[PDB]
Paper text:
Among DNA repair enzymes, human 8-oxoguanine glycosylase 1 (hOGG1) plays a central role in the base excision repair (BER) system acting against the strongly mutagenic 7,8-dihydro-8-oxoguanine (oxoG). To trigger the glycosylase reaction within a crystal, we created a pH-responsive mutant of hOGG1 in which lysine 249 (K249) has been replaced by histidine (H), and designated hOGG1(K249H). Thus, the hOGG1(K249H) mutant is a monofunctional enzyme with glycosylase activity alone.
As the hOGG1(K249H) mutant is almost inactive under basic conditions (pH >7.0), we crystallized the hOGG1(K249H)–DNA complex under weakly basic conditions (pH 8.0). In this way, we obtained a catalytically active hOGG1(K249H) mutant crystallized in a complex with an unreacted substrate, and determined the 3D structure of the pre-reaction ground state of the complex. The oxoG base was flipped out from the DNA duplex and bound to the catalytic site of the enzyme. The H249 residue was located within the catalytic pocket, but the distance between Nϵ of H249 [Nϵ(H249)] and C1′ of oxoG [C1′(oxoG)] was 3.9 Å. The distance indicates that a direct nucleophilic attack of the Nϵ(H249) atom to the C1′(oxoG) atom is unlikely even if we consider a conformational change of the side chain in H249. On the other hand, a water molecule was found within a hydrogen-bonding distance from Nϵ(H249) and Oγ of S147 [Oγ(S147)], which may indicate the catalytic role of the water molecule. In the other catalytic residue, D268, one of its carboxy oxygen atoms is close to O4′(oxoG). In the ground-state structure of the hOGG1(K249H)–DNA complex, no proton-donating residue can access the N9(oxoG) site.
Numbering used by the authors: 10 to 325
The structure:
Amino acid sequence: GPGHRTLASTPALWASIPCPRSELRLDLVLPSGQSFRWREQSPAHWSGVLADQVWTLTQTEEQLHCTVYRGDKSQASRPTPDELEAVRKYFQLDVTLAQLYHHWGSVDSHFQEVAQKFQGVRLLRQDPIECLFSFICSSNNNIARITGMVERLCQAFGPRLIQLDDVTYHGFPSLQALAGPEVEAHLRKLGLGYRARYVSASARAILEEQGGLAWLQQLRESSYEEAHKALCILPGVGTHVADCICLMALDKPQAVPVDVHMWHIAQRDYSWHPTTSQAKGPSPQTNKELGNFFRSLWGPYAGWAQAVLFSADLRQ
DNA sequence: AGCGTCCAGGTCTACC
DNA sequence: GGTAGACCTGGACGC
Ligand SMILES: [Mg+2]
Ligand code: NA
């Protein structure tokens, strides 16, 4: 297919959004386990599917530059203002990250130290269905393997969009495409392990028991506590996966995922231990208490502070 | 030399 | 509700 674009080579095809590097670092966000579907196909340029089309993104010191491949056999052109608005919404640029970093650092000297080296880590606003099934794939697993799982799931069950160079881009599958009893066996062939059943059973539960796709919008409109409880009915969704979906797709900025990294960060970097349980190791009660500890420390956007520490912990 | 253990964005099941 | 251990997969890497 046609080439993945670079800004300096094809300037007529790009348009900018005001966005300083203090507000966003693509290299610290897009490969860090929020979305699994972006790749640095040219140095400093990240390509992936965003609002149903492929985009490439790159940045200068003060701007986020964007290019879109419409794949409808139309003539190439720069993104329009209306298309750029989808990118601005995906990066939630109405939230001023530099102010949150100052708040978090004022209450937490450890955060302040890490933040100095990890500027521009913000939270993507993701599609609920993509986020749900990506995080079902994430449990007891590592980011490189999760990334492959998600790519193979999309290639097998999602619509083909376009090919750039030798990369064929697919959209994320629908609920219906993931729900049939033949799907688990295919996802097992694709190496999803025991999560193959969780993916297909969760798609069937949403369609057959929760009222279909509108349930995810209902959870976006519900409180954090209500949304988190509701997601936990799904096979493969426990309190951590539910917190990931709440934070990253359901607009719950105080949701704090607690995985292996955040548990070890609490112990190593905060000397924290639970005080609501005599036994101190990970457990439902202690993982719950740890989420509450980080909310109490960082405030109503505690999940966003978690994303900074998580991204940094991947690099150490 | 390469096997085998540890480990990774945890959840489920069984049992008390 | 608390506790404990199994669990698909494959890269890191000690022995
Ligand atoms: Mg569940
Ligand atoms: Na609903």
